[PDB]
Symmetry: D2
Subunit: 241 residues, 4 copies
């Protein structure tokens, strides 16, 4: 009946959301730099490129009216402000902002424009856009300045976006994951991965991709969740190290 | 295996919706409220601020099955300015709101947690889940809502230290902060508030609060957090 | 020219604020359970008792128009939700709420009512009420449920109070101290005191009472600071333990 | 001993006020802005997004005395809806706001911090203090302020991880989030915003922002925090 667009759907959180949406009955289109082998429609592209996002949005609309949009594409970075040879590189900082923040904004503006004339459902909804930030937007650790800044931008985008899109019947919600198998964790060594996981109160483990997917699906089913950032982190509050 | 649930404030509004949803989910539900009602639920009449009443309700739940879900939805409201026409905001009215909304929630949390501390962990390592109810007033209190806001801000702040400690026992603590809902709780003010909700542009339905509560119970990763359920509302001064 | 009322002025933060205000030229009245030997006016009483607060407010007004009110009276508690014999006591929880939250509200409502007819200054201000919360209102540690709850109430009171009192030209601001020599620290053993202090990024030490006083005086001198909670914590974010 | 200061955006508004206040405080002040001005300050014309320009300004400051205070007040605004009449919010306009407000602030922070990393600590153990400027829009962005809000939210989030790392070098990082100020930056919208400020019921004066910046510099305990300077304003959707 409806289509969904999931960026970053080739793996991790995006993959879980895409599979859950497919099982729920959505005609799912994945936008990712890579393609995989699940029973999903894969559009290979970059969220920072408007042409690629536009192609993915149109592909979804060809399947059915676009209702659910999940931005889960992102990159991580572990780099200190003061390095051993000099200060944090400017290009690495720019890249993280480009993918995590600009990419999310790019998907939001393009999907929203394309969904603006959707016939509303019984709740008056034309669609729902779910973005993915990180707890790093709130308790960034040493070495996470770029990542934290990019995610803080996503967090701040939530309200002004929801406020405007409310007139069009489009909700905007942000999920802020704690420690899961994502680029954040992937860019760290074992020693670091262990100590970080040890900081999570309960469940005392890495989050399961399916748990992120479950929250995303609940957001889609609950009209009252809007303009909010939901922490999915097992009560984690990251220490400096 | 069947488990029991305790819902305070279950005679009406949000608590009632949560209790009914949990019952439909298969829980053996016990309601603690100043009054009983006529739904197919087990009712214990009492006060959340009274140790004796909460213990009675907890025991009644365990009588059915091991206690797992606890939802604190009992509360009172108050609209009173700090500076009135004849004098300052009364001290007793402030104390009462704090007692019911904050101390009552803590009373239920401490007694329920103690009762579940020895439950055999479920497949997710959980011995139980406690869901408290704050309000967006804890973040954007309007003129005249100082007492209510303060009580709910206390509930918000309690979430993390409680979750941090109870984590060792496999007991989660999460808080839902509702916006404007259609609950039994001046037309002029209600209209001004309603007009401030971006989307959906209406009062929230108790069932939507219940839906969020049930998902918290089913999602192990939601813990030590406050979830705003408000249609993007940010209350202005008036 | 103006009087000031500082609760908890017998020691620590309140004492520093009282001394700083006196040096600034204010006719300072201290409300505290104890009296001391500084060149201040001491009114012995309990912030939870309206008669005592009313006596202190009137004493200040007898000296000069009451402009600055600083609520720094408070108590601490280290008690787990699940103890060795049973759950956290209800009375200990109630006591912390009574002193830290109700006491602060009591001072605010009584001082504000008494200052409501004050001739406004050049900025239109009749007075400024500064409350004291704690970072525990945001990152409460294990054993700090009661304390955190009481301080969270103070934090939440700030905005609705400032919004209403704005019409009367009275500002309401809250300072949220990190680790200082206060009841919070005083109720802990050496081992604990050391590990807590070690969590503070910079300055890597306990805050100095004079640093809290300096912020309070700046708040009094800056009309634009209102309805906000200012963290004074050396970038501390308390871990579970 | 005399120290130098670097203030970006010092040709006007908030930055100008901070620069003038620091000069009066005894600092050897260098301003980095797209244009120079006529105050008794040292001006370096450049772009905060350009490594070469920031390095030139930092070097110019060190020429006067060891760099201690850095204030990032350079920025641009934008009012643009996500959904316009002919199409969606432009991508380049969004990128530009992010580049100047967020990347520019980071560029200044990383280069200034590197330059101060070997300064002999002062009596408080400080090698320097970096004060960034966000906006309350980072918390309550209005309709049409998505780009601006996002850029400022990034500045807010940068504060803690930067302060945490730089703590080891004795360099503090604090952020000021101004509300509505009388800066060179539609009458209909400005009026609606002004009417939302509780107290003082007026536009903030640049000098009040400067006063807060100077107190941050003088108070060692203010670190890794965002201080709202907004007269209790909480921006509504419109
Ligand atoms: N620029 C990008 N465009 C689309 N997908 C991306 C981009 N950067 C990372 N991803 C994807 O994000 C998912 C991780 O969030 C990965 O599957 C990865 O391939
Ligand atoms: N002190 C209290 N103890 C138990 N239930 C209460 C209390 N105060 C209010 N309630 C209930 O809260 C529900 C509203 O939250 C109402 O059904 C009401 O009867
Ligand atoms: N109930 C109370 N009333 C007045 N001052 C108090 C109270 N409880 C603690 N204090 C004071 O608070 C200061 C510490 O905040 C101490 O000087 C102490 O004596
Ligand atoms: N990219 C930039 N680099 C330096 N100064 C800038 C930049 N963009 C805006 N400004 C300045 O910011 C001040 C406003 O914050 C203005 O004086 C303006 O000239």
């Amino acid at each position: 009946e409806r289509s969904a667009l999931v960026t970053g759907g080739a793996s991790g959180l995006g993959r879980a959301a895409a599979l859950a949406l497919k099982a729920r009955g959505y005609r799912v289109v994945v936008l990712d730099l890579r393609r995989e082998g699940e029973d999903l429609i894969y559009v290979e592209g970059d969220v920072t490129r408007e042409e690629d996002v536009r192609r993915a949005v149109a592909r979804a609309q060809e399947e059915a009216p676009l209702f659910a949009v999940v931005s889960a594409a992102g990159v991580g970075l572990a780099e200190k402000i003061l390095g051993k040879e000099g200060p944090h590189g400017l290009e690495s900082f720019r890249r993280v902002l480009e993918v995590n923040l600009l990419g999310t904004f790019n998907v939001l503006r393009l999907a929203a424009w394309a969904m603006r004339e959707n016939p509303p459902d019984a709740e008056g909804q034309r669609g729902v856009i779910v973005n993915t930030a990180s707890v790093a937007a709130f308790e960034g650790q040493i070495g996470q300045a770029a990542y934290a800044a990019s995610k803080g931008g996503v967090v701040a985008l939530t309200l002004p976006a929801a406020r405007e899109l409310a007139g069009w019947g489009i909700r905007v919600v942000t999920v802020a994951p704690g420690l899961f198998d994502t680029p954040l964790l992937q860019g760290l060594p074992e020693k670091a991965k262990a100590s970080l996981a040890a900081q999570v109160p309960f469940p005392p483990r890495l989050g399961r991709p399916e748990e992120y997917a479950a929250l995303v699906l609940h957001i889609l089913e609950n009209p009252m969740l809007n303009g909010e950032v939901v922490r999915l982190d097992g009560a984690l509050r990251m220490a400096p190290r």
